[PDB]
Ligand binder design. Sequence first.
Ligand SMILES: CC[C@H]1OC(=O)/C=C/[C@H](C)[C@@H](O[C@@H]2O[C@H](C)C[C@H](N(C)C)[C@H]2O)[C@@H](C)C[C@@H](C)C(=O)/C=C/C=C/[C@@H]1CO[C@@H]1O[C@H](C)[C@@H](O)[C@@H](O)[C@H]1O
Ligand SMILES: CC[C@H]1OC(=O)/C=C/[C@H](C)[C@@H](O[C@@H]2O[C@H](C)C[C@H](N(C)C)[C@H]2O)[C@@H](C)C[C@@H](C)C(=O)/C=C/C=C/[C@@H]1CO[C@@H]1O[C@H](C)[C@@H](O)[C@@H](O)[C@H]1O
Ligand SMILES: Nc1ncnc2c1ncn2[C@@H]1O[C@H](CSCC[C@H](N)C(=O)O)[C@@H](O)[C@H]1O
Ligand SMILES: Nc1ncnc2c1ncn2[C@@H]1O[C@H](CSCC[C@H](N)C(=O)O)[C@@H](O)[C@H]1O
Ligand SMILES: [Mg+2]
Ligand SMILES: [Mg+2]
Lengths: 250, 250
Amino acid sequence: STGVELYLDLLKRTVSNFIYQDATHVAGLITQAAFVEEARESGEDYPTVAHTAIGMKRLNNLQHCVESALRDGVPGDVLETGVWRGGACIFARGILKAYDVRDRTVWVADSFQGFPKITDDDHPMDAEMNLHQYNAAVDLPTSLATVQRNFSRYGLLDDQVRFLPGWFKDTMPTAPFERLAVLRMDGDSYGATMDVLTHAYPRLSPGGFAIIDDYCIPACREAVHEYRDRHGISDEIVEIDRQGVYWRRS
Amino acid sequence: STGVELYLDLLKRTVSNFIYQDATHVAGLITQAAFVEEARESGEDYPTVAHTAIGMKRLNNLQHCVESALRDGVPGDVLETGVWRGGACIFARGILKAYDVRDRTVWVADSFQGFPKITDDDHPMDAEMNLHQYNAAVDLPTSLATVQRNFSRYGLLDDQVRFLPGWFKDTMPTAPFERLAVLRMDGDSYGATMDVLTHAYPRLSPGGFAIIDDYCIPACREAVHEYRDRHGISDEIVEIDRQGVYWRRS
Ligand SMILES: CC[C@H]1OC(=O)/C=C/[C@H](C)[C@@H](O[C@@H]2O[C@H](C)C[C@H](N(C)C)[C@H]2O)[C@@H](C)C[C@@H](C)C(=O)/C=C/C=C/[C@@H]1CO[C@@H]1O[C@H](C)[C@@H](O)[C@@H](O)[C@H]1O
Ligand SMILES: CC[C@H]1OC(=O)/C=C/[C@H](C)[C@@H](O[C@@H]2O[C@H](C)C[C@H](N(C)C)[C@H]2O)[C@@H](C)C[C@@H](C)C(=O)/C=C/C=C/[C@@H]1CO[C@@H]1O[C@H](C)[C@@H](O)[C@@H](O)[C@H]1O
Ligand SMILES: Nc1ncnc2c1ncn2[C@@H]1O[C@H](CSCC[C@H](N)C(=O)O)[C@@H](O)[C@H]1O
Ligand SMILES: Nc1ncnc2c1ncn2[C@@H]1O[C@H](CSCC[C@H](N)C(=O)O)[C@@H](O)[C@H]1O
Ligand SMILES: [Mg+2]
Ligand SMILES: [Mg+2]
């Protein structure tokens, strides 16, 4: 175990709070508050304190994607769309820091207000799901200032972390990045997924990775397949855990 | 910058819980529960959750002592007497892990049940202080099993961590280590300090470090000076923060 391996291993345990094992909110299928190791390992609970909810398997996937991009010389930045308390983005910045990468940026995109209120412009599956109803229940609204504060606690708030506050339909089309090596999508809805695929995926480098955190949600999956069909994308969809999948852009 | 530096920096922030900033118990001179950065930085509060109470300055000192011993080839193990939830010993094991040191052990010595009830054999200053009164108030009693669990959460429970459960007057004289490079004393009382100086200090290598966590406590200081006078020890006492001091054995 090298210094780098030890740091990144600890960083994953810390952002997911395997260290102190905070209770989960009781919501959805989670019926008790107790920390359950298997649930945190696969990112299935709603941490009361942890900086990410994606779990160890999806953190490991993020590491694999970033390391592979670095190893293979895939150009570009890392973007996460849907960051909550920022833990996955903190981890991404940590990976770059561990390898002393100074020429890539972690872009942190969120409304910083939780899920949007549904209107008649929403896809019917998003309207039915109405994720907005869960904002308070899982402490989803997390301000930009809080996310910045969280980065600073790890010593990782610096000029290689850039923030894109706003709804993805507004921020993605003109987001100032030129190229992405990893595009990590974690907005849950058809709308958020389609917004980001439409406006950010064209900037994903060949050899880069597209991660769909919420593929288990029918609305999200619907967007993925509609987008891939439209663009003739046949790159293998690889399952990570019970929620997430990814593909590598050929 | 380097992987090692990043890992050890993160490990300090984690064991002291600068990451999630848990409340303090309201006790002693601490009059409110809120996390205060300055108090955790100098190890002056009573963390509700964090694995160590010693704070960042004393964690930095422990790192300095261990790194200096390794750098200078000072032979021996690391012993902490008075470990609470184990965070300072977890950090010590992490330092050895970071440098891939396989030939030194971290010894973890505690009653694993908090301060002892005062008896007629106790030093009058210890009787007056009666540290036993605080056990439950600051959650001091922490079992061996809990401490082992805590090490495991960092991936640092292995055969280079050895436990010495019991009162120091019982465990120290025949503790199986031969040599120490760092002796970290954090038992607060005249009795605990004198027990450990008497029975462990003779095994501290020349060039090794003796850390007195609780030098601000009159009873502890009394023991330190009595011991040093008895043995003709004049090695400079160097202040770390508002509580701790150390010297290097010449
Ligand atoms: C609490 C927040 C959460 O809400 C739930 O989990 C709600 C679960 C419903 C209650 C389920 O319905 C029940 O199924 C029973 C089996 C039979 C029930 N009935 C018929 C008796 C029926 O009522 C769902 C199956 C409904 C479908 C539409 C669905 O998938 C909805 C997804 C909702 C996801 C939100 C956001 O969480 C995101 O999750 C991502 C995965 C994470 O990565 C992360 O990003 C996170 O932020
Ligand atoms: C809560 C637990 C704690 O209790 C206290 O802190 C009690 C503080 C008293 C209230 C103080 O009195 C006040 O002084 C004011 C200056 C004027 C006040 N008054 C007359 C106006 C007077 O009332 C003390 C100074 C009294 C002296 C005998 C002393 O030092 C006692 C030490 C007690 C330490 C325990 C164990 O905590 C350990 O501390 C280590 C240092 C840590 O590293 C760590 O190991 C930890 O576990
Ligand atoms: N259309 C939209 N535009 C911008 N942000 C959105 C959005 N829909 C959802 N979000 C945001 O998407 C996030 C979903 S949760 C993200 C989890 C996070 N990746 C983690 O590591 O735990 C929330 O922060 C929410 O505010
Ligand atoms: N005589 C004695 N023998 C063994 N353990 C003792 C003792 N007197 C006090 N202790 C133990 O000394 C510890 C004091 S607190 C130690 C704090 C710890 N170093 C940290 O990193 O935060 C407690 O765990 C208590 O159980
Ligand atoms: Mg998700
Ligand atoms: Mg102390």
